[PDB]
Coordinates of C-alpha atoms in Angstrom, one line a residue:
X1 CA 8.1 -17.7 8.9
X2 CA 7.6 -14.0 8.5
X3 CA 8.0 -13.0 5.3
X4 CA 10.5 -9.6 4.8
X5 CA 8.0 -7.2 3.5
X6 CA 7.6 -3.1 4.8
X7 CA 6.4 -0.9 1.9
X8 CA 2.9 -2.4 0.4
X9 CA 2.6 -2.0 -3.3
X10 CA -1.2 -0.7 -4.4
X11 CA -2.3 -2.4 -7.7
X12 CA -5.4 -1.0 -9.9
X13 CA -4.8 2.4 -8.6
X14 CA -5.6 5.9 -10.1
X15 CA -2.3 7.2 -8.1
X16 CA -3.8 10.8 -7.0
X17 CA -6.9 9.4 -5.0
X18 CA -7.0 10.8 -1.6
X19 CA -4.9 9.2 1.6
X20 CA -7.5 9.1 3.9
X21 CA -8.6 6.4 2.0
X22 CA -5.5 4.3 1.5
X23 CA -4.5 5.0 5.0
X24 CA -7.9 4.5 6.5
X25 CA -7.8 0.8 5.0
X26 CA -4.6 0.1 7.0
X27 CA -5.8 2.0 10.0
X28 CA -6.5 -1.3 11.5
X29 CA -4.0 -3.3 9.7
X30 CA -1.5 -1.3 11.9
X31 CA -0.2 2.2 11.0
X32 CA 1.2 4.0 8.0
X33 CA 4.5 5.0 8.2
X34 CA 4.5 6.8 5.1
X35 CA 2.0 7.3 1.6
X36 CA 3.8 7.9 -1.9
X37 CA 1.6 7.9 -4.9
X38 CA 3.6 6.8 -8.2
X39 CA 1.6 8.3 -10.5
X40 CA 3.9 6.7 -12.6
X41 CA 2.1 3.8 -13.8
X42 CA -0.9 3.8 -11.5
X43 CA 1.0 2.7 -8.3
X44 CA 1.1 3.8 -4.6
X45 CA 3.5 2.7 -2.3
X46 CA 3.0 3.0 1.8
X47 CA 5.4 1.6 4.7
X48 CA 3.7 0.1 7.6
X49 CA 5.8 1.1 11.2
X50 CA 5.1 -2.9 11.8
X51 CA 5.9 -6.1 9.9
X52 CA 1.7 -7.6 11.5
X53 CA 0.6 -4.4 9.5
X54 CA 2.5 -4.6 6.0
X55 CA 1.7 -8.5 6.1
X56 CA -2.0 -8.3 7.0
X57 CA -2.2 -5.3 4.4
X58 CA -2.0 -7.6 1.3
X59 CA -2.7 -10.8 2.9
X60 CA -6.2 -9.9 3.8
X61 CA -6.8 -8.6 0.4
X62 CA -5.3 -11.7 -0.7
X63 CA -8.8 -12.4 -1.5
X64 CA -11.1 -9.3 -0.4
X65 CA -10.0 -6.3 -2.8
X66 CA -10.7 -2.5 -1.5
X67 CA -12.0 -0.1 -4.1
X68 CA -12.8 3.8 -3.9
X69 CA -16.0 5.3 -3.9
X70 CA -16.4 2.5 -6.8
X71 CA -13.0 1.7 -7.8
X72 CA -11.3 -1.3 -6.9
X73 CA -7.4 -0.7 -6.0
X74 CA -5.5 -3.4 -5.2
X75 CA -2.9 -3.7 -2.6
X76 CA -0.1 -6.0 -2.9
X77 CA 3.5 -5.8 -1.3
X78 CA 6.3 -3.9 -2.7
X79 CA 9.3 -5.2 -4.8
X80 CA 12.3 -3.8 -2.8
X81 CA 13.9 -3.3 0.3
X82 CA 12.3 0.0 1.9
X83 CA 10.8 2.9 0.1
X84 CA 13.7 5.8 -0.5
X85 CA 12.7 9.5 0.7
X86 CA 13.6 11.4 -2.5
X87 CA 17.4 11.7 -1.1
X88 CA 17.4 12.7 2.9

C-alpha cells in the first residue's frame, strides 16, 4: 500500500540550479510544499503537500530521468521522516 514518503531526495544534482526547474517538474506531480538545496553533497530535498505527488515524483522517474538545460538530476525520495525548517 502507500508507501510513507513526503520530502523527495534529488540525485545527480549541482544543488544551486534554479527552482523553477525542480518545481516546474513536480508542477504536475502535485505541488511543492517546500525546495532546500543541500549543497552539501550535490542534494536537493522538496516536500510535496500530497502523498500522489511525492510518490509519482520518483516513481515516474523510476525510469525517465529529468536533466537541466543538459544535466540530468535525478530525483529519488528522501531518507527520513519530514524535512526540518532550520529550527521554527
Amino acid at each position: 500500500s502507500g508507501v510513507p514518503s513526503r520530502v523527495i531526495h534529488i540525485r545527480k544534482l549541482p544543488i544551486d540550479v534554479t527552482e523553477g526547474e525542480v518545481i516546474s517538474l513536480g508542477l504536475p506531480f502535485g505541488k511543492v510544499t517546500n525546495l532546500l538545496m543541500l549543497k552539501g553533497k550535490n542534494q536537493a530535498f522538496i516536500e510535496m503537500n500530497t502523498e500522489e505527488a511525492a510518490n509519482t515524483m520518483v516513481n515516474y522517474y523510476t525510469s525517465v530521468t529529468p536533466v537541466l538545460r543538459g544535466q540530468p538530476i535525478y530525483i529519488q525520495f528522501s531518507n527520513h521522516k519530514e524535512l526540518k525548517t532550520d529550527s521554527s
